[PDB]
Amino acid sequence: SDRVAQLTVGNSSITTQEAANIVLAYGEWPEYCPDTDATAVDKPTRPDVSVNRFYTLDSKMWQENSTGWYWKFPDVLNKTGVFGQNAQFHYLYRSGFCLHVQCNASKFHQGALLVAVIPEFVIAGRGSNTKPNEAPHPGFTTTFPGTTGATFHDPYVLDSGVPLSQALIYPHQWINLRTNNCATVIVPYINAVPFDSAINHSNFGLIVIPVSPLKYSSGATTAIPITITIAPLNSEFGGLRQAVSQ
Amino acid sequence: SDRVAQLTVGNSSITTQEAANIVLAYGEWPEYCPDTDATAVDKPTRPDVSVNRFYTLDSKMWQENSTGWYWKFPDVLNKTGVFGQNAQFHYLYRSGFCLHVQCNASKFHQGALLVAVIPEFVIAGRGSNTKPNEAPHPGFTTTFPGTTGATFHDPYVLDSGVPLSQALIYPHQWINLRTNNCATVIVPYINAVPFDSAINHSNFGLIVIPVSPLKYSSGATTAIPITITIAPLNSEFGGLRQAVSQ
Amino acid sequence: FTNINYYKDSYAASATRQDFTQDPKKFTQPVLDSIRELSAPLN
Amino acid sequence: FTNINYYKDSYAASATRQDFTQDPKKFTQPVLDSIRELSAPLN
Amino acid sequence: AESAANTTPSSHRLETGRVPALQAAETGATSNATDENMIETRCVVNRNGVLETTINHFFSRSGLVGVVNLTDGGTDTTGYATWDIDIMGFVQLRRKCEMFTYMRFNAEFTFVTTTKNGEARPYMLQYMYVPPGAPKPTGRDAFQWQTATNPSVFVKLTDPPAQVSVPFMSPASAYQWFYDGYPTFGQHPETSNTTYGLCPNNMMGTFAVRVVSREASQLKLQTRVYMKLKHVRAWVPRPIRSQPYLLKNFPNYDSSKITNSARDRSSIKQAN
Amino acid sequence: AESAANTTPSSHRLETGRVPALQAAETGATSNATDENMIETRCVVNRNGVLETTINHFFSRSGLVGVVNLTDGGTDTTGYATWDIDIMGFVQLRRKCEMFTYMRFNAEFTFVTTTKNGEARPYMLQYMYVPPGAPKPTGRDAFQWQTATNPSVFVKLTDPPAQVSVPFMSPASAYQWFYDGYPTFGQHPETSNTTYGLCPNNMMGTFAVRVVSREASQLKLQTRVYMKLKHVRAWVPRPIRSQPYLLKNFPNYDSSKITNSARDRSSIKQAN
Amino acid sequence: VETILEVNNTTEATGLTRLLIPVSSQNKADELCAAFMVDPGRIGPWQSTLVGQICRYYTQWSGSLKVTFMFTGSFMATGKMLVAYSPPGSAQPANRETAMLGTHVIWDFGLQSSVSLVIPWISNTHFRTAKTGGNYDYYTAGVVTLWYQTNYVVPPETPGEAYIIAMGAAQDNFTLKICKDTDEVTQQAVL
Amino acid sequence: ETAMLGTHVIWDFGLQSSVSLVIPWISNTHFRTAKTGGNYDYYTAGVV
Amino acid sequence: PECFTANGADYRGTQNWTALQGGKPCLFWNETFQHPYNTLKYPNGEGGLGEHNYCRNPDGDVSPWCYVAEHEDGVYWKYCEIPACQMPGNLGCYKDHGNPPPLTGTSKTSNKLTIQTCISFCRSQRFKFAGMESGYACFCGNNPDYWKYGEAASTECNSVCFGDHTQPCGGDGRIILFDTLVGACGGNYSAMSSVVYSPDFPDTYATGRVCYWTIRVPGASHIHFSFPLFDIRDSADMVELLDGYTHRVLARFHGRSRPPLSFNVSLDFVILYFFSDRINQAQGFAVLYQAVK
């Protein structure tokens, strides 16, 4: 009565057989901007169907020597569909997200993953140079990976100087291959401003890191992918102008 | 709602995931000696914490050619801790016991064990001599094995001349490796006298006998131990004097 | 007592009265199904 | 009067009101049988 | 909740179905297993206080923020000494402050000025707060030191240290030390992103100081800034950094030569 | 009882059975023989006060506690000066304080700093209170002098002496200068027990002081600590020591050369 | 809030394998698994958690703790373990028959794959200083030892090496006192 | 120091010149057989 | 080298100052009727007491010390910082500040902590340098830079140990350094001129100690031996000198035999034998050798 679930948003539906309870981030549901907290004057648009649905990204094979992956959510589905088209024409943006990460295997595989959101997940440069001219900084595809994603180099320090062990304070969930095969996190709009550009600022980022390695005996299946879907709950847009690319 | 359980006694706790219902011996809970049935005059002591907790014994590897093991419960935890120290100084003793036998394996192993209590489990000597001078009798480590335990020689006759097939009249429980991995039996104080010495008389004895042999394919794990914990519920002691060893 | 300010502004005062509103379930149990204390988390 | 403190803490004040509770029989007559004043201490 | 927590008397249970010690961690929740659903406890009433562990009592410490030099030479002198106001210069208050994402507070800056070898001569100073957009003074006798429509403090060296209260002056609703984004638009390079992570809503002007005189003063002063937080509110707690800081306004760490979060032991099966 | 005691008029008795002057001392009790059950007294009303003899008026004296030196040389200098806070260094306040077993109070430490030959130049000092577990500063320009999450006092030499209030900070319910026991476990030697009587619940950190400057200061300061007790409660009164103190943290006396509690007389049958 | 303990903080370990506890099939009937101290202000496994840094900011702590283990093996892998807490006194216990006299919880590998050993407050005084030994052994808390109860049995064609993730948090009666500076940072470069 | 762990009474030589040590009934069963040792040490009572 | 003991009990020098740079003079050992250590009660040596004012150690202290003139400031005795008083295997004392320690390795705390227990704790884990401070510490490490905080004076690091009360276990915030080679059983010694101590040298040697010290040099002409320290008061335990080519014994030393201060052997494969007993153990040896090329 609890390990089954069907999440339906718009014209999409996600069915599962082995699931834990859904994680609601900070106890707050995604809601529309109230008139007291608002600061713009132009009326915002609310498509409510074409931008509120489960967009499925690509799958990534989880090998034995894998380190992990991360995304930037107001940047991943920024070029795909009506949400991206509506976000390229407008200047202001505000929405929540529903998350779902699929990873199934047999009852003979072992391993565990950690999927969590990190608000304001700034990527750190890797180097030992303090001069301003040679201090290493991450590239644009490292900061904003896009719909593909980026890999970790030192996932022990979250590629940010912050230890992974303390990253359980964020809204997180485990994917233990002996217990479940999916993880679901609902996250509201977390920002210090009511509206913000969905192109020059990623609010938070999803991270999948295998802490327990994938292990199996010789003879079983060897292709274990990680699939992720994203639902932009309660989308709002404002400041209509020409469409920009980036 | 029934295959999970958490038994907490004192400062100990036993968690499980695959369990049957607890077995209550003869429908009687362990209770304190009533004043009508008592015969001593000195006031008994009741520690209620330091002697009422789960003491864990050693583990024994269950091989393919195993026959079984048995213990004597007012003798196993007779030298370990506050219960043993309190039982060496006093002359009278009365308590119940809570039992728990752990044996986990994969879903590819097969086999079944039989854990049961036998009140007044007297060990029989093995031989065909009727002369009083050569009639074989068991040694002290065979009658009272201690905290280690003793093995069976002829577990088909329970090493007592009594058949194992009829030993289901005792309070028993099965450990079937396809159903559960633990067995729990709660037993009250069973004796024909209110109080009794916990050194010169064992009330009953636990017995673990594998009737279905342990079988597995080549490649799986090969170390299958048997772990046992004991909780002395409702302990009472009387007749305080110098501490004796045995 | 408590060093009230002598100014027209309100940010130039000292620390005001304390507030013991912890509400720690927003970080420890951020789930939708209220897990009972004596039950299994998964059925 | 008496130099009341101007702080949030309570240990930073001066000496509070006095207390004249002597109760000196806990050291001078620590016995169980109440010895009368006009009597012999041993019979 | 003025105290911590009380413990109710517990007892033993011998029955099936109730398992409080099997809290599944795959759900992302914290185990809610108390003492009373476990080993037999007693009745204790706790009077230990929880007042000191609050945010307002945790951030009401001054600490050092900035050090400003003032050479005031004779032939290659400068006269003034500007210092942009930022708290990411000393890793103590930065490490204490960077365990949250969004904060909002008021400040109580205190200025302590001493001499090079250590001495307090009665020279009068002038501390000036230049907001962003106001022109910076160039010279010890510049036009900007008139302080018209500009707050300034006149104090000597023998006087007690000055102390002014600064309100919350960010254009947004709260502060933030982590801005995963870009301040401008257009195309961004891939080799050197010197504009990534630049906190836009954090610049708070430049602090300035000179010596009020006519000709010069053969002295080398060195003033220190101590900022106390008050009326503080924190959001979205972040894990505490475990790597040594390397840059001023960029979180970086050494790829090689990584520091572990814990020290080493001889063996895993040994507590000492 | 705001006054001492009043005397009721008495008279003579000539009768058998009532003996108030035969209080047996084998019982461990104090003789309860008053004046009215003895020689004929008069009616006097006493207005003498008993306010000064209380514990709160007996322990509200400052006295000297510690003396801390600060050489601040040029080539073999130290810069800082730590001093562990303990009151068993000067036998006056120790003798006054060691007539009880368990005490509990608050402190009003006052710091008086002077120069070697005697002079008050306006040099700024920094008094730091390092609790147990915090790192001790090593050097006059060390990292610990930032005083973040650490109480400190900045005062000059020409200023009046500083005075801070210290609360009751023992982990137990009260203080104790007599601990008949051992702090650790295991086997204890028989030759030299340097761990016997070590008061565990009495360590209160280390007090530190330096001079706020850049290069150095050719001066030799010497600060004195005066601790005033207040809000004091005493338990289990102990007899007053009659032997000269010999060690800092161990009650010892000379086996030979014993001091008598009273002086000598010529004869026992002579009052002079 | 639960946070991963670093029990495998010894050498011969990289960053990710530093947070795991290896579980295999022992040939001897009873063996000792990883063990660690309780005091969260002491250099060791409690240094990688958030509660350890919070208690390193302050100087005295009270209240009970919680350590929640989590089994990340296969589905067909079963077994039982003994997690045991022991108050101060003698050294770390040598065998299980000595370690099971304290506060212990028998743990199984079932559908629910996490047990939470609670560490009760068994101190003599009200507060303990977050300080390591020397002359400060007066404020030690004890040792948490993890023992093999029965075994790690596994069917064939299944890997026989699992891992257990250890997490730790605080209780409702956990309270702190006097604040100070932490000892995680002493030196700093001029930024 | 071994014998005073049982039931004992401190006795003085005063004006009253007799003490009465009572021997409590500390048996495990209800009745004891009035028989000496050998295999009958099960019914022994103790030493004064 | 002048001190072959961990506390400088055998120091016969002529330093009549407390320190050579900025010190106060020591008082004579015959002008000290006020204090219980003088020549008027200890004639014929007893630690070394003549008509001089040298820094001796008659009371079994952690360091040599003399009587300073009391300037009405309390202290009437100060430790003498002797630069040439260090047993070979004692690197010196250094400072200890914080999170980067001087020795990056494992640590251990104990209520009984002598020098040899920490040396054995660091040696059983294959570390190069030992270290201890404040009486209860054992810092192991292999790093070549342990002076990152500076070198401190030897008089500053004279806090007493816990298992023994005649050995200096560093001080509060000051670590004392040692090599892991001292007090061991055996070692492939191929240096030019080293020192060989008995097993458990700072402590007393254990019962049933027997080991093999092998001395090999890449082609020296002959070796030169010396015996600075030698104190065994039993007739069972014994030291031997062996040849490893055809296994012949060169010399057999015993407790009842006074060994010569120096002799020569024209060999380069010297073997050392040391059979302990189980009845009496008092002190070991400090054999110093030198190879002539």
Ligand SMILES: *[C@@H]1O[C@H](CO)[C@@H](O)[C@H](O)[C@H]1NC(C)=O
């Ligand atoms: C120390 O002894 C030397 C003799 O070598 C002597 O010249 C010198 O004056 C002595 N110094 C003192 C302070 O006794």
Ligand SMILES: *[C@@H]1O[C@H](CO)[C@@H](O)[C@H](O)[C@H]1NC(C)=O
């Ligand atoms: C102590 O010995 C020195 C060295 O010979 C001598 O000069 C001095 O007079 C002696 N003192 C006494 C009191 O004999």
Ligand SMILES: *[C@@H]1O[C@H](CO)[C@@H](O)[C@H](O)[C@H]1NC(C)=O
């Ligand atoms: C050993 O040889 C050296 C020179 O080779 C010589 O100086 C020394 O006296 C010799 N020792 C003996 C005991 O002959």
